[PDB]
Design an enzyme around this catalytic site. Structure first.
Site, PDB file in Angstrom:
ATOM      1  CB  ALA A   1      -3.810 -21.555  -1.364  1.00 33.98           C
ATOM      2  CG  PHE A   2      -1.831 -25.624  -0.286  1.00 31.60           C
ATOM      3  CD1 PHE A   2      -3.055 -25.053   0.108  1.00 31.60           C
ATOM      4  CD2 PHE A   2      -0.843 -25.836   0.674  1.00 31.60           C
ATOM      5  CE1 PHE A   2      -3.285 -24.696   1.441  1.00 31.60           C
ATOM      6  CE2 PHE A   2      -1.058 -25.489   2.008  1.00 31.60           C
ATOM      7  CZ  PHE A   2      -2.284 -24.917   2.397  1.00 31.60           C
TER       8      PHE A   2
ATOM      9  CG  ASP B   1      -7.153 -30.975   0.448  1.00 30.40           C
ATOM     10  OD1 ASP B   1      -6.952 -32.066  -0.143  1.00 30.40           O
ATOM     11  OD2 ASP B   1      -7.532 -29.929  -0.163  1.00 30.40           O
TER      12      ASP B   1
ATOM     13  CB  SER C   1      -5.411 -24.423  -9.602  1.00 35.47           C
ATOM     14  OG  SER C   1      -5.998 -23.270 -10.173  1.00 35.47           O
TER      15      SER C   1
ATOM     16  CB  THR D   1      -3.065 -27.410 -10.229  1.00 37.44           C
ATOM     17  OG1 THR D   1      -2.598 -26.059 -10.097  1.00 37.44           O
ATOM     18  CG2 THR D   1      -4.231 -27.439 -11.214  1.00 37.44           C
ATOM     19  CB  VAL D   2      -7.170 -31.126  -8.231  1.00 34.84           C
ATOM     20  CG1 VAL D   2      -7.653 -32.572  -8.257  1.00 34.84           C
ATOM     21  CG2 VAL D   2      -7.085 -30.633  -6.791  1.00 34.84           C
TER      22      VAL D   2
ATOM     23  NE  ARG E   1     -11.382 -24.387   0.966  1.00 37.63           N
ATOM     24  CZ  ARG E   1     -11.617 -23.445   1.878  1.00 37.63           C
ATOM     25  NH1 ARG E   1     -12.829 -22.922   2.008  1.00 37.63           N
ATOM     26  NH2 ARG E   1     -10.636 -23.018   2.667  1.00 37.63           N
ATOM     27  CG  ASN E   2     -10.024 -28.944   1.438  1.00 41.19           C
ATOM     28  OD1 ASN E   2      -9.907 -29.064   0.203  1.00 41.19           O
ATOM     29  ND2 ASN E   2      -9.343 -28.039   2.130  1.00 41.19           N
TER      30      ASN E   2
ATOM     31  CG  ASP F   1      -7.778 -25.236   4.698  1.00 48.06           C
ATOM     32  OD1 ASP F   1      -8.651 -24.384   4.978  1.00 48.06           O
ATOM     33  OD2 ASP F   1      -7.233 -25.318   3.576  1.00 48.06           O
TER      34      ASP F   1
ATOM     35  CB  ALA G   1     -13.907 -25.457   4.194  1.00 48.50           C
TER      36      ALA G   1
ATOM     37  CD  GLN H   1     -11.352 -44.781  -5.096  1.00 55.13           C
ATOM     38  OE1 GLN H   1     -11.454 -44.849  -3.869  1.00 55.13           O
ATOM     39  NE2 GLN H   1     -12.363 -45.067  -5.911  1.00 55.13           N
TER      40      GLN H   1
ATOM     41  CE  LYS I   1      -4.801 -31.041  -3.203  1.00 55.34           C
ATOM     42  NZ  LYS I   1      -5.905 -31.375  -2.224  1.00 55.34           N
TER      43      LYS I   1
END
Length: 275
Positions: free
Chosen positions: A21-22, A152, A19, A24-25, A138-139, A134, A136, A88, A44
């Protein structure tokens, strides 16, 4: 440009992967009508807006329309408990985590290759006039070792200082060229193998630090060449920074002679450079 609306019970959650800011996966499974197929899918749920609007439906459609080699296509949307973006499932998960866990089995080739890919990933967004905002490590997700995708994108159209360009910190001016700055950091994140940008430094000091002319340091496995690329991405002036086209071309030029630009030790020998 076809978006799938998915039933609340055509969708079944297994676990939580993370999870932010926005929302939760959730790792999930999807059973389209009948009892024949079951995807592995990534869910999401956004917790607050954004509600089932035409305004919503409009932006979803655009995102459904987003289509790359190296961009994560939105597969479907559910609305029933709240808003849910269905993707996916990427088995290997996010690149950030990936370059840490395999730190010792990742050659130069992949590293530059990922560069190119994210580069092209962005080209498209740029060509479609979508600003990620955004970017990074991570995304960016890992479909396969040699195949990464970005996710994202445009999430703020529905709804990260250390990856923010200076002009977005002060004047929240969000541009392709502000994403460029993000890229810079993202790749840096890779070279270090998952290092934490501006480590052991607070948030609210970042801006003045930057203004001083202090940027993120040279990564161990980096020839000055590729570092100078990075540096250019953190140029105070937006226009002065590279366009994704260029960054592609460059990293793509470099993936022809991989160890010529990144030096990675271990293997009991000491690789030596020139010129």
């Amino acid at each position: 440009a076809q978006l799938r609306i998915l039933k609340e019970t055509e969708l079944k959650r297994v676990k939580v992967l993370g999870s932010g800011a926005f929302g939760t996966v959730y790792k999930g499974i999807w059973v389209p009508e009948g009892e024949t197929v079951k995807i592995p899918v990534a869910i999401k749920i956004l917790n607050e807006g954004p509600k089932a609007n035409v305004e919503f439906m409009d932006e979803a459609l655009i995102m459904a329309s987003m289509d790359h080699p190296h961009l994560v296509r939105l597969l479907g949307v559910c609305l029933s408990p709240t808003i849910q973006l269905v993707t996916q499932l990427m088995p290997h998960g996010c690149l950030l985590e990936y370059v840490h866990e395999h730190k010792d089995n990742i050659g130069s080739q992949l590293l530059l290759n990922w560069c190119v890919q994210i580069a092209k990933g962005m080209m498209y967004l740029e060509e479609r006039r979508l600003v990620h905002r955004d970017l990074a490590a991570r995304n960016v997700l890992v479909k396969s070792p040699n195949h990464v995708k970005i996710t994202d994108f445009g999430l703020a159209r529905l709804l990260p200082i250390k990856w923010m360009a200076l002009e977005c910190i002060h004047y929240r001016k969000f541009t392709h060229q502000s994403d460029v700055w993000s890229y810079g950091v993202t790749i840096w994140e890779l070279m270090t193998f998952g290092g934490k940008p501006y480590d052991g430094i607070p948030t609210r000091e970042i801006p003045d630090l930057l203004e001083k002319g202090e940027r993120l340091p040279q990564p161990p496995i980096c020839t000055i060449d590729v570092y100078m690329v990075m540096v250019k991405c953190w140029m105070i002036d937006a226009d002065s920074r590279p366009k994704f086209k260029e960054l592609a071309a460059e990293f793509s030029r470099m993936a022809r002679d991989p160890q010529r630009y990144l030096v990675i030790q271990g293997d009991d020998r000491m690789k030596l450079p020139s010129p």
